[PDB]
Backbone as CSV, one residue per row, in Angstrom:
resi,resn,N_x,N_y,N_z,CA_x,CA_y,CA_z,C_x,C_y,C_z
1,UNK,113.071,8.254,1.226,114.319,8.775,0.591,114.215,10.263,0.317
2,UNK,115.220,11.362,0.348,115.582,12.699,0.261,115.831,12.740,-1.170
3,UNK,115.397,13.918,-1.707,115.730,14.260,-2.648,116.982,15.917,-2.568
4,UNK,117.875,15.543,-3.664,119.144,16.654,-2.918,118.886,18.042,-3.892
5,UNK,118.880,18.423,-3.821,119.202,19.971,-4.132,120.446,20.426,-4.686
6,UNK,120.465,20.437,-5.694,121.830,20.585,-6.451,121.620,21.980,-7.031
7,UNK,122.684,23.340,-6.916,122.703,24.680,-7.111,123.182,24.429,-8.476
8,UNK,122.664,25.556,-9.119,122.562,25.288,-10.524,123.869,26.763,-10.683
9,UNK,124.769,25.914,-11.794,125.639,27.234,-12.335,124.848,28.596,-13.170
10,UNK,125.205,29.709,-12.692,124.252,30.510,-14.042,125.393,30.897,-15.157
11,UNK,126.317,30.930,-15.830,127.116,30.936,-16.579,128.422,30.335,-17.205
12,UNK,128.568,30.081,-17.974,129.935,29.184,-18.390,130.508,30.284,-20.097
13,UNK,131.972,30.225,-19.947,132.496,30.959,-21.010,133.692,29.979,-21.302
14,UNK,133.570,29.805,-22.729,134.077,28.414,-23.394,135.399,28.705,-24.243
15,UNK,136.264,28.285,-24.681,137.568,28.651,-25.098,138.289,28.017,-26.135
16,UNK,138.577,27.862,-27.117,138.970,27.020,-27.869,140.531,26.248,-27.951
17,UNK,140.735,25.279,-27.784,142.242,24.547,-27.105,142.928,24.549,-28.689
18,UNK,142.676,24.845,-29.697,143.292,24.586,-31.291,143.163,23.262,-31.800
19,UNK,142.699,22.340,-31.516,142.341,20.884,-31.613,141.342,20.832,-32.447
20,UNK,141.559,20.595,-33.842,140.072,20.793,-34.922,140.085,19.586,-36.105
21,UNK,139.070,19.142,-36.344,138.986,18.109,-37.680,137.779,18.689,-38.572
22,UNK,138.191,17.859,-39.703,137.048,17.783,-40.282,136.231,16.714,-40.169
23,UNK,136.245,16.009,-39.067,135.655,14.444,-39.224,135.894,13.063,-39.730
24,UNK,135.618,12.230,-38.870,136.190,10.816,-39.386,135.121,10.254,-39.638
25,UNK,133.760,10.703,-40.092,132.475,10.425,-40.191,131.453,11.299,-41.325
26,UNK,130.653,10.651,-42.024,129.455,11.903,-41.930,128.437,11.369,-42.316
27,UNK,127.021,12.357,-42.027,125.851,11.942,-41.931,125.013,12.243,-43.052
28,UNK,124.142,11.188,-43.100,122.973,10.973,-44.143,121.744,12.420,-43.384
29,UNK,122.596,13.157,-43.512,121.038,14.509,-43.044,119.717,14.593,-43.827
30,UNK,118.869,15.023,-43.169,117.289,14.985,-44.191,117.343,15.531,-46.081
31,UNK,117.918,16.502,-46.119,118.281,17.402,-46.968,119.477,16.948,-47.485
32,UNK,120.502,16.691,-47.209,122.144,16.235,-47.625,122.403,15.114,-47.199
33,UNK,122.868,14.115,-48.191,122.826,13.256,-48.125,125.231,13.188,-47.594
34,UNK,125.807,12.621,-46.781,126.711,12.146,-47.021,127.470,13.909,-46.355
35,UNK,127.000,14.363,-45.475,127.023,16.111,-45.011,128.184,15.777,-43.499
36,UNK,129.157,16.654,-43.894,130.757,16.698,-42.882,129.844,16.999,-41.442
37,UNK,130.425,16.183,-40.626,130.556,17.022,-39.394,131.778,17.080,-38.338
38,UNK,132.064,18.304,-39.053,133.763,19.268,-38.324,133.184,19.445,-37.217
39,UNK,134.071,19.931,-35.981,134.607,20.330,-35.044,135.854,21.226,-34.593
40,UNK,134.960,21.605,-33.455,136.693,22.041,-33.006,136.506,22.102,-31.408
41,UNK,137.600,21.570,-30.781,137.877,21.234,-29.622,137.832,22.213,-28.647
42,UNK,136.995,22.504,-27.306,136.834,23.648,-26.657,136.698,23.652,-24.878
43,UNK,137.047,24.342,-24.090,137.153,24.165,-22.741,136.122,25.146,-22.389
44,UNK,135.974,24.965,-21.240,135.004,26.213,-20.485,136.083,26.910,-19.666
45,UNK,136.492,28.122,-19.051,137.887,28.752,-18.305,137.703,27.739,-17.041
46,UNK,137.297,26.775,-16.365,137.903,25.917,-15.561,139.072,25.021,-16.329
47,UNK,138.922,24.810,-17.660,139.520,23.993,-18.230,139.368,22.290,-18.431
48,UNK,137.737,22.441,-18.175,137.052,21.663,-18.562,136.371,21.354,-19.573
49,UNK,137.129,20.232,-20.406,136.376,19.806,-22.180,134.634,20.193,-21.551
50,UNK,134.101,20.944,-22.984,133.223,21.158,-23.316,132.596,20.374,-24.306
51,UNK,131.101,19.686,-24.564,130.880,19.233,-25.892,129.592,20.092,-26.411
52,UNK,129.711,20.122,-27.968,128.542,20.496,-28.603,127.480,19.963,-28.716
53,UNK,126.466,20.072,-28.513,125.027,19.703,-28.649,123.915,20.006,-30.025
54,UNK,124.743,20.479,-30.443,123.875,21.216,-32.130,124.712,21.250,-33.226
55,UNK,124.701,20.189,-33.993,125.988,20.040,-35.048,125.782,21.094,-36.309
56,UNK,124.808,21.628,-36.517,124.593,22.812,-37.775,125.171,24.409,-37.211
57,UNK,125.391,23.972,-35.702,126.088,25.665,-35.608,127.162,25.604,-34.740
58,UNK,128.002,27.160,-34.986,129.406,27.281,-34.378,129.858,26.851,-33.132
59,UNK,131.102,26.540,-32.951,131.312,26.720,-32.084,131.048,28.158,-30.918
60,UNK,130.791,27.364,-29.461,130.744,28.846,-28.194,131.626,29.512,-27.749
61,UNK,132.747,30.033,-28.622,133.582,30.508,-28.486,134.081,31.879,-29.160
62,UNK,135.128,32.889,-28.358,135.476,33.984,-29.385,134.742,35.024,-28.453
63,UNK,134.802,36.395,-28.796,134.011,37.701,-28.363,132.285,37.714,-28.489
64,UNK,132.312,37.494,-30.073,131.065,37.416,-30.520,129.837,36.128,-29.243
65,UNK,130.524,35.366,-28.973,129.751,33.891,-28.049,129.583,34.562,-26.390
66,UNK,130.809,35.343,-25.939,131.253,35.731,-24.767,130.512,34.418,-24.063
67,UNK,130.048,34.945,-22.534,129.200,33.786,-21.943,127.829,33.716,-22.596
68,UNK,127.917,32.077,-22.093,126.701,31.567,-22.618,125.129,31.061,-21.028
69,UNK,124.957,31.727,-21.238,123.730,31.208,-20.060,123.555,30.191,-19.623
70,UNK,122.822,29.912,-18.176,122.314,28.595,-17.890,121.245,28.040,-18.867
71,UNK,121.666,26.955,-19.357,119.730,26.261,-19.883,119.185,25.099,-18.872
72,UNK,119.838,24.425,-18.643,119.590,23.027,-17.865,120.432,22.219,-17.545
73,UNK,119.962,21.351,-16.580,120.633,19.667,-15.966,121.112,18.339,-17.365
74,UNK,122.290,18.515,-17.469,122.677,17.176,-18.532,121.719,16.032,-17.478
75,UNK,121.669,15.342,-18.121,120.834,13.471,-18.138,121.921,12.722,-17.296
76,UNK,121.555,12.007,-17.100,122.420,10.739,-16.801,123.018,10.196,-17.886
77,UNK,122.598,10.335,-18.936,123.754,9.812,-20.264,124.643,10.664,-20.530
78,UNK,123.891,12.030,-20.550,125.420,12.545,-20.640,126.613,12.619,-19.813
79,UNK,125.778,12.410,-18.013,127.228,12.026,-16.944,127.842,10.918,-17.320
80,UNK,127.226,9.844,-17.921,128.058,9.034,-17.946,129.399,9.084,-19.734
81,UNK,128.459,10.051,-20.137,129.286,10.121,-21.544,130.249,10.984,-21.196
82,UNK,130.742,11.866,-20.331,131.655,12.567,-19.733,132.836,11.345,-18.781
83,UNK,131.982,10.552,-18.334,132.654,9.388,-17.069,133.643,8.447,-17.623
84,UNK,132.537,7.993,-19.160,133.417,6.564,-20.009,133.937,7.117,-20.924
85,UNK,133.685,8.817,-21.320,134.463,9.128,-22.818,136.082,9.888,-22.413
86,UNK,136.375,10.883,-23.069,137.301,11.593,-23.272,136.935,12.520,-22.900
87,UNK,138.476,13.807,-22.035,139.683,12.825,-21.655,139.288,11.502,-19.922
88,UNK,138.284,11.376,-19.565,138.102,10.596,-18.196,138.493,9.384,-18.487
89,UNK,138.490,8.950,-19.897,139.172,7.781,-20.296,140.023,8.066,-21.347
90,UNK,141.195,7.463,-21.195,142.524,7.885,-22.462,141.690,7.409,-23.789
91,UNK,142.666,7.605,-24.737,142.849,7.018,-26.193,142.873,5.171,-26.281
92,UNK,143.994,4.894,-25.592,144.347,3.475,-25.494,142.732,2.659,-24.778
93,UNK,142.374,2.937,-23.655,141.212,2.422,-22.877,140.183,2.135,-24.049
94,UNK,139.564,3.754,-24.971,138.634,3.785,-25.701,138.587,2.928,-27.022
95,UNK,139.913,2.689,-27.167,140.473,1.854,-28.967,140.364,2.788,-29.413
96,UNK,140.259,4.428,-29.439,141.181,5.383,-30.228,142.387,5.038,-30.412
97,UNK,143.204,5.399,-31.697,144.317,5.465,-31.867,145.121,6.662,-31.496
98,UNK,144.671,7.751,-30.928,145.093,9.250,-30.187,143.961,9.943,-29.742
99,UNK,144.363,11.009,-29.400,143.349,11.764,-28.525,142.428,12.699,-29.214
100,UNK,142.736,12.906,-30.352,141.483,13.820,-31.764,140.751,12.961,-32.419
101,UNK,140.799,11.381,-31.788,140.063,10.171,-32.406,139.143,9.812,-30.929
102,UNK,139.897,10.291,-29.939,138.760,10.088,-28.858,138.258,11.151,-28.110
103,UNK,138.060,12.255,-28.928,137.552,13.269,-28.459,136.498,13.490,-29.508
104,UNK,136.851,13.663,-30.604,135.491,13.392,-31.762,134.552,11.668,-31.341
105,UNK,134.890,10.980,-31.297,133.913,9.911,-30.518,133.172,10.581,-29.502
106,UNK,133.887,10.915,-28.875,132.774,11.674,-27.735,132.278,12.704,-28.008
107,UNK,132.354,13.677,-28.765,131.106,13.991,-29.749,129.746,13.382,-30.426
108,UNK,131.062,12.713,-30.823,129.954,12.027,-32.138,128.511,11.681,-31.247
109,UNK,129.082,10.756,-29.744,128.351,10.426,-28.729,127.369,11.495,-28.464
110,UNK,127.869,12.719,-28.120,127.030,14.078,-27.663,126.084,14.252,-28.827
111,UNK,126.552,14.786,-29.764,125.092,14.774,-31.246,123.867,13.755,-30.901
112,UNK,124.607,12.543,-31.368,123.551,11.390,-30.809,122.271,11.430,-30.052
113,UNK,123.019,11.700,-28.401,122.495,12.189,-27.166,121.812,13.599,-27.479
114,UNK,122.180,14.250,-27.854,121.118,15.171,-27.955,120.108,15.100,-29.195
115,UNK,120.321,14.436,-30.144,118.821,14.675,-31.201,119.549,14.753,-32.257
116,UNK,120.755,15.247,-32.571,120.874,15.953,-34.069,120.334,15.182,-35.110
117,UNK,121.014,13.677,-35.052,121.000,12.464,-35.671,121.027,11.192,-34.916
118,UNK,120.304,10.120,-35.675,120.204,8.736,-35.321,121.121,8.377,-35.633
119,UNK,121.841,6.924,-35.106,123.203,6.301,-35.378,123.008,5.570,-36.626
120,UNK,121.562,5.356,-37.220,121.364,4.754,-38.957,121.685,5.833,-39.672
121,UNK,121.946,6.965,-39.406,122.265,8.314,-40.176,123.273,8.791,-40.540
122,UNK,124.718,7.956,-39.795,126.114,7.924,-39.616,126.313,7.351,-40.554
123,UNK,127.214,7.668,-41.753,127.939,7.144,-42.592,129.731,6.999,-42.604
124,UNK,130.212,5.934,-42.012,131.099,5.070,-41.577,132.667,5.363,-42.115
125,UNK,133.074,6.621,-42.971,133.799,6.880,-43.727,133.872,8.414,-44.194
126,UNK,135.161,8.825,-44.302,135.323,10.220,-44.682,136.549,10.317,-45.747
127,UNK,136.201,10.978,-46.693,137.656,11.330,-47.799,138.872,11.199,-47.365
128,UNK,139.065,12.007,-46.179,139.923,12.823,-45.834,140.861,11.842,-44.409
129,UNK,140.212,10.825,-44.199,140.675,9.856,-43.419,140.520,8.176,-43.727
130,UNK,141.648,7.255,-43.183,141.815,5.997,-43.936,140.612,5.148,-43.127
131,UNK,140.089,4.079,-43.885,139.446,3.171,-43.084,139.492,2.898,-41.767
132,UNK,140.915,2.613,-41.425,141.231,2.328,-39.733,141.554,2.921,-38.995
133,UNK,141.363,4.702,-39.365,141.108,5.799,-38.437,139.925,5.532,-38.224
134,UNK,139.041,5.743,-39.364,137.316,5.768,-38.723,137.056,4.796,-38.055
135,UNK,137.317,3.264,-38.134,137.304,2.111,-37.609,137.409,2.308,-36.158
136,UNK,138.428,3.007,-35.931,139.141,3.163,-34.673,138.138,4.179,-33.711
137,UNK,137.776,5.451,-34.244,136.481,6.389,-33.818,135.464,5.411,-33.793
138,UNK,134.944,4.396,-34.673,133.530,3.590,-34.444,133.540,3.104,-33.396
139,UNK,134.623,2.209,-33.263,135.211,1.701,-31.801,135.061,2.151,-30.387
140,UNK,135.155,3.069,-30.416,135.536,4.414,-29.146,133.554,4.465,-29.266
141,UNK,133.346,5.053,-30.226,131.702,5.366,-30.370,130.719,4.765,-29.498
142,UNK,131.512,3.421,-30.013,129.872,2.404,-29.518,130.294,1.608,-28.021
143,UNK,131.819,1.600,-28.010,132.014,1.871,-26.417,131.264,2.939,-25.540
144,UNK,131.414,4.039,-26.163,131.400,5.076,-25.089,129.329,5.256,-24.887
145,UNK,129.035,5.035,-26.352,127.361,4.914,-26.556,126.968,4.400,-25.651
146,UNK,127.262,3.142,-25.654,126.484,1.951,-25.059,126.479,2.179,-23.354
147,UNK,127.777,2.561,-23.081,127.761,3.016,-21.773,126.810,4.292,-20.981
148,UNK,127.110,5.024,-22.525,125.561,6.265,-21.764,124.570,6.041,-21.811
149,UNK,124.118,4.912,-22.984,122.533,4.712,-23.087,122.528,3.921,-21.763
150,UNK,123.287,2.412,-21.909,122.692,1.335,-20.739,123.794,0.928,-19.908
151,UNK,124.509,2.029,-19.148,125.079,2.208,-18.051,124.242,2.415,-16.667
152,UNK,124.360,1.910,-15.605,123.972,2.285,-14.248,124.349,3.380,-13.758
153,UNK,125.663,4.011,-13.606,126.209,5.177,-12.644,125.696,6.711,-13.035
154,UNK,125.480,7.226,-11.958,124.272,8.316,-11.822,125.354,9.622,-11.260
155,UNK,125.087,10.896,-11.456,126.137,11.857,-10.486,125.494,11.630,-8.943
156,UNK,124.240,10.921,-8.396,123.790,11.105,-7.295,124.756,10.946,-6.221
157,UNK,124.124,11.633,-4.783,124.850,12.086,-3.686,123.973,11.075,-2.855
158,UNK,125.010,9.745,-2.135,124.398,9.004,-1.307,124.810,9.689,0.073
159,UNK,123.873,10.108,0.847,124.217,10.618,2.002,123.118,9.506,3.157
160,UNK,124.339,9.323,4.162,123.197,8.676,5.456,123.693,8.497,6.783
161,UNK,123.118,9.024,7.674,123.284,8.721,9.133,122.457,7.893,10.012
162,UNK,123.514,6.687,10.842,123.321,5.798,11.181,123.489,5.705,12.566
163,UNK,122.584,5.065,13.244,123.054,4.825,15.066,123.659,4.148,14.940
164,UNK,124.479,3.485,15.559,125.871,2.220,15.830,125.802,1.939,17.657
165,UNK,125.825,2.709,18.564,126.123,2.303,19.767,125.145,3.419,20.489
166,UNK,124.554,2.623,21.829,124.009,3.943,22.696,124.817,3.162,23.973
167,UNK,124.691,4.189,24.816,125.010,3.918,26.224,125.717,4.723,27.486
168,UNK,125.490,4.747,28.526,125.427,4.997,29.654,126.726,5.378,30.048
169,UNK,127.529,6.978,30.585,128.690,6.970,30.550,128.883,8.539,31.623
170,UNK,129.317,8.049,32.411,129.231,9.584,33.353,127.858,9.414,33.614
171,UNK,127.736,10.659,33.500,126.337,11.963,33.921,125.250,11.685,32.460
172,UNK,125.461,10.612,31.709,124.780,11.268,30.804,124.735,9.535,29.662
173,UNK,123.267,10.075,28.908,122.780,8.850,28.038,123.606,9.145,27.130
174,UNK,124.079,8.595,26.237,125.254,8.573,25.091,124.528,7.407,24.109
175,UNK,124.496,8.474,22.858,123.963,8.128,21.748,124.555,8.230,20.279
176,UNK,125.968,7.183,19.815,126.479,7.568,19.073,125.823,6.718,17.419
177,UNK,126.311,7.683,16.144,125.584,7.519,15.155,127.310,7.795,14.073
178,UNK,127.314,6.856,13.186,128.143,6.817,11.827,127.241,7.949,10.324
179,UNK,128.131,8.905,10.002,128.044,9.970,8.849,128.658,8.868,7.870
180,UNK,127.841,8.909,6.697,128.667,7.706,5.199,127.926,8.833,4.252
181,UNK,129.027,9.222,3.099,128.560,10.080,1.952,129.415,9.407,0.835
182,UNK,129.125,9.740,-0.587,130.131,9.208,-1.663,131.038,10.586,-2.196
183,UNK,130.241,11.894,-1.143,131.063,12.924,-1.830,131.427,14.050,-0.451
184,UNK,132.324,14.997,-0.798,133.262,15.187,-0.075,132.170,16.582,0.755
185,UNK,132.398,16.675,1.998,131.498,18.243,2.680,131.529,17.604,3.702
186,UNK,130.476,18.222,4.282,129.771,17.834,5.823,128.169,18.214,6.295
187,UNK,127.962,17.902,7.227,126.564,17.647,7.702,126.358,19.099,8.763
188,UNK,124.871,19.492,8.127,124.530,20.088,9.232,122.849,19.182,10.136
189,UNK,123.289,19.623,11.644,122.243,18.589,12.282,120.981,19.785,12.588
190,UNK,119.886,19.477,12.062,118.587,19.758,12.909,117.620,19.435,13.775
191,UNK,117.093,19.826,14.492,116.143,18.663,15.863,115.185,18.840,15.335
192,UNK,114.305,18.297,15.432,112.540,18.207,14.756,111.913,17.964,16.319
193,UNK,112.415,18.219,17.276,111.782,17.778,18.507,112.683,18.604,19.494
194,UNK,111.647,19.127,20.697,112.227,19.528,21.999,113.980,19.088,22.047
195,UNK,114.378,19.838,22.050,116.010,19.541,23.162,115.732,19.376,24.142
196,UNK,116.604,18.105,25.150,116.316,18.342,26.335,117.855,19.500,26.760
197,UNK,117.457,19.895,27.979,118.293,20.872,28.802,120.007,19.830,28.913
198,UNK,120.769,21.031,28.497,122.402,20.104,29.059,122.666,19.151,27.828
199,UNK,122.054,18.974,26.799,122.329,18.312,25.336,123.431,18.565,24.752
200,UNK,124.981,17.874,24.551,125.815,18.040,24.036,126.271,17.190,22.668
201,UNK,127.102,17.568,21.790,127.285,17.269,21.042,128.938,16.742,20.905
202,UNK,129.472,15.804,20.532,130.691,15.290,20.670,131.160,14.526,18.959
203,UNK,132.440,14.976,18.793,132.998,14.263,17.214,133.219,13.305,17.391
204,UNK,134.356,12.398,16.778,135.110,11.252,16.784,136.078,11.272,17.659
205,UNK,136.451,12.658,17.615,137.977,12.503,18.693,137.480,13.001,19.865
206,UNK,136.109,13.064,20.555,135.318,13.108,21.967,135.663,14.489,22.173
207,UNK,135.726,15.385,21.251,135.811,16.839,21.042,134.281,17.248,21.031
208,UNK,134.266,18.286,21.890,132.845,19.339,21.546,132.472,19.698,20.310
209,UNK,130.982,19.005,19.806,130.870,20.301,19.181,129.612,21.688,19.149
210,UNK,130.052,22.517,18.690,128.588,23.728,19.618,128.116,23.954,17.984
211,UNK,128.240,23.896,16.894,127.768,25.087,15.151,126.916,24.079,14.806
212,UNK,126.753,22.547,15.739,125.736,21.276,14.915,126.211,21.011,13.637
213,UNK,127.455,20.774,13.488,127.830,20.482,12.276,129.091,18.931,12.693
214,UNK,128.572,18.192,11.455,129.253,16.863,11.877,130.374,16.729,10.387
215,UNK,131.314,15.780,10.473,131.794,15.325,9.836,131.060,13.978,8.876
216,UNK,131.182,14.008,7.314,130.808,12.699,6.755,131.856,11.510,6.874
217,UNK,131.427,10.442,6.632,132.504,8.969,6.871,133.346,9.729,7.644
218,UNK,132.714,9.435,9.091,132.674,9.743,10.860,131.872,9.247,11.508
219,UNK,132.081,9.654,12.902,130.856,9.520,13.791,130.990,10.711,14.524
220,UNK,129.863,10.792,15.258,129.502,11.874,16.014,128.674,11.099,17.363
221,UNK,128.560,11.625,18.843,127.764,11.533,19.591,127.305,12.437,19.835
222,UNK,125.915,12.143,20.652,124.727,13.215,21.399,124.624,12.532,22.578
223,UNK,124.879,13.485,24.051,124.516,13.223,25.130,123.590,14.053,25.851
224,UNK,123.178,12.907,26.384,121.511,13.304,27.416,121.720,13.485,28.917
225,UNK,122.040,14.658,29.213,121.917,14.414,30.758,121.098,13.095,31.729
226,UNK,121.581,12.225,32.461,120.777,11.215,33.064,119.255,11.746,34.274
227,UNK,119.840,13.114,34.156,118.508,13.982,35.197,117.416,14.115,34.550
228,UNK,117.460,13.930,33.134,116.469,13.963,32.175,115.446,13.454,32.372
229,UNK,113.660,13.891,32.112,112.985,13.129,32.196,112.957,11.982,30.979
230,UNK,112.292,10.726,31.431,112.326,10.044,30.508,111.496,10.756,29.235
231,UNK,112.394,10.215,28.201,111.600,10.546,27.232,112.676,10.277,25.289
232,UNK,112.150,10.932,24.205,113.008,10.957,22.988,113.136,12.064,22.891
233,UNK,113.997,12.111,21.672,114.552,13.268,20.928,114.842,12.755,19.372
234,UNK,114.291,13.762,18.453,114.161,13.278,16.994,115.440,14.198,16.153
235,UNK,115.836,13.928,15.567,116.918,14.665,14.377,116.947,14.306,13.118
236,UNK,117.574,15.114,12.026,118.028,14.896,10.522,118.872,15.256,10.329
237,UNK,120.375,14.857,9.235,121.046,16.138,9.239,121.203,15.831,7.960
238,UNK,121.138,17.531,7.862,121.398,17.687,5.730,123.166,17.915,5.425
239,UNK,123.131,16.966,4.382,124.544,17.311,4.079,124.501,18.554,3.147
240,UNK,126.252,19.338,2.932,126.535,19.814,1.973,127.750,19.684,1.646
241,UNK,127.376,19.439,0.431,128.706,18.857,-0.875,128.952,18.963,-1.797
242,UNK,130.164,18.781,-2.544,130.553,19.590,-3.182,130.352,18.197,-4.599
243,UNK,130.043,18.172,-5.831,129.713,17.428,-6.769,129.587,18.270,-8.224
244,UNK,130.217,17.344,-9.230,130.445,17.429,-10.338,129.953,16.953,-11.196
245,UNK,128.845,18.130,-12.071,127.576,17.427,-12.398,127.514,17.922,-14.267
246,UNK,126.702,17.341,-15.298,127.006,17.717,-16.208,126.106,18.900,-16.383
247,UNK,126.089,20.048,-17.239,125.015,21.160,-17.460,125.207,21.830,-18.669
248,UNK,124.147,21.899,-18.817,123.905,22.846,-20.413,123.832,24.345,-20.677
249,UNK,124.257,24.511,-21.792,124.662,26.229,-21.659,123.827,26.715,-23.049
250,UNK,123.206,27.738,-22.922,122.459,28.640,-24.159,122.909,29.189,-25.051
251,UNK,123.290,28.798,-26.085,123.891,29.489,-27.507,122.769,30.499,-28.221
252,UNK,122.207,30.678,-27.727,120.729,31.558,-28.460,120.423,31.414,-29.524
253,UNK,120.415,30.115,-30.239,120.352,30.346,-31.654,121.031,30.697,-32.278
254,UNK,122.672,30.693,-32.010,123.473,31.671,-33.030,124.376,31.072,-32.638
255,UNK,125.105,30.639,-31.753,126.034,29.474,-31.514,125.646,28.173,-30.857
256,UNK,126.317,27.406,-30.772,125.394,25.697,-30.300,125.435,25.750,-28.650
257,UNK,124.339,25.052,-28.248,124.521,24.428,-26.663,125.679,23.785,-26.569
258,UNK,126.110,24.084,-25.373,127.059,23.432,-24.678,126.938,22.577,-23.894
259,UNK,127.829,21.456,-23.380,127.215,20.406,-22.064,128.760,20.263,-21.458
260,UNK,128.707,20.229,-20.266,130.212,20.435,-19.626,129.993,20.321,-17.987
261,UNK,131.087,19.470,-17.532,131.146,18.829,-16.220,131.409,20.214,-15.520
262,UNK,130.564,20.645,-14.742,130.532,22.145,-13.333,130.470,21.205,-12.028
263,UNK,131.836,21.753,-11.207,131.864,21.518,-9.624,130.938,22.438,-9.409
264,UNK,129.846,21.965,-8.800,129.281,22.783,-7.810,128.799,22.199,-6.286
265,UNK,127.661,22.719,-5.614,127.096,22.351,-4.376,125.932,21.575,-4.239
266,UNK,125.661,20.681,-3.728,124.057,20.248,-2.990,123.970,19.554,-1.792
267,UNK,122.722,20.350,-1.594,121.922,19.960,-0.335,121.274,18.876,-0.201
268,UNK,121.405,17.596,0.814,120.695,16.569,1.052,120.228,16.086,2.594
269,UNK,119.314,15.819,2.561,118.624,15.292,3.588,119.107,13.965,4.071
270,UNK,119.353,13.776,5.409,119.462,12.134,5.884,117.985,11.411,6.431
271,UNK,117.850,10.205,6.616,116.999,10.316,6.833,116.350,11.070,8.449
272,UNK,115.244,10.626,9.377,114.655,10.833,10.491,115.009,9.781,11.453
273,UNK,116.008,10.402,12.676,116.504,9.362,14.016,115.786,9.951,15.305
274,UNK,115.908,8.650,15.615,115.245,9.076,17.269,116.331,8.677,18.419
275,UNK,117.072,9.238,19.048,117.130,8.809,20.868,116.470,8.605,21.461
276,UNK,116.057,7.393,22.431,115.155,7.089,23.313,116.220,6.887,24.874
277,UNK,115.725,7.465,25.806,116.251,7.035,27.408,114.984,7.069,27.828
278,UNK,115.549,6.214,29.046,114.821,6.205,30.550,115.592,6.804,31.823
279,UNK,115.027,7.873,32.717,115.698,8.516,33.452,115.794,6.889,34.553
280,UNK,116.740,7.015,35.007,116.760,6.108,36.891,115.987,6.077,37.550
């Protein structure tokens, strides 16, 4: 199996949408017992929800924050806390009762996920909101929790090329192979072995192609001149694609990490094929 190569964003600059609480929750902290944790609702300029990762400091937003640096790769909990929370899932789906009840859940989720506090540390109730608001955020919570802790779905890039048919056609050995990806780009092909002489390359619609570049969920053929001596020919082809992955941003100590879904690129390997003929 290939491991893919995913290009890392180096900056994100975060924005605030006016969407703010004081919490439908608060926590038993080491020091404070029964201690608020406010928010306020924030995008990165794609206009992609952002979440906080450090509940004791500001929001990444304003002049003073400008951009915030690369730090690292979100987890697989947090892709999936982006996948099952808010907005990728409404209010109604989550058992929020609106969308500032399922957007603080998915917080609450992010703290969690990152360290701030344990979920025995959550205290179930806030002044400032009725029982079956918070009820309604617990709800959404341990939905959306449970799915990041012991969920299966990964951001990974299944890429693979497959033979399907060989055979004999004109002037030439014909060796066709099926492209299957879960994400959107295309393939470039490399030989790991001699070309033979007169080696062409053909799409789906029996179109040339000369740049070695294939289409994914397609096919492609390779033909062998029949003058050929007997013999193989080996290939791989790496995809590139385009994927939406979660990543963390550097507050320096003075405003909080960020974690936020970035389109970007990666590189993957298929596996190693062989063509085999026999000349006449």
């Amino acid at each position: 199996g290939a491991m893919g190569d995913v290009t890392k964003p180096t900056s994100a600059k975060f924005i605030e949408t006016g969407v703010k609480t004081d919490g439908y929750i608060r926590v038993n902290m080491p020091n404070h017992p029964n201690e608020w944790m406010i928010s306020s609702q924030f995008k990165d300029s794609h206009g992609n929800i952002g979440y906080c990762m450090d509940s004791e400091l500001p929001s990444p937003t304003g002049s003073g924050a400008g951009s915030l640096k690369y730090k690292g790769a979100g987890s697989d909990e947090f892709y999936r806390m982006f996948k099952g929370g808010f907005p990728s899932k409404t209010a109604k789906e989550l058992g929020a009762g609106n969308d500032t009840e399922a957007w603080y859940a998915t917080q609450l989720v992010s703290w969690v996920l990152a360290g701030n506090f344990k979920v025995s540390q959550i205290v179930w109730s806030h002044p400032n909101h009725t029982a079956a608001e918070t009820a309604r955020v617990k709800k959404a919570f341990e939905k959306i929790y449970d799915y990041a802790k012991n969920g299966k779905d990964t951001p990974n890039t299944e890429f693979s090329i497959t033979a399907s048919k060989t055979a004999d056609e004109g002037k030439y050995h014909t060796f066709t192979y099926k492209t299957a990806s879960n994400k959107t780009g295309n393939a470039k092909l490399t030989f790991t072995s001699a070309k033979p002489a007169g080696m062409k390359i053909y799409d789906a619609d029996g179109k040339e192609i000369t740049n070695n570049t294939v289409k994914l969920n397609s096919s492609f053929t390779i033909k062998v001149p029949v003058t050929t001596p007997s013999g193989t020919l080996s290939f791989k082809g790496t995809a590139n694609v385009s994927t939406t992955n979660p990543f963390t941003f550097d507050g320096r100590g003075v405003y909080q990490d960020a974690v936020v879904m970035i389109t970007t690129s990666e590189t993957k390997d298929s596996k190693s094929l062989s063509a085999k003929w026999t000349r006449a």
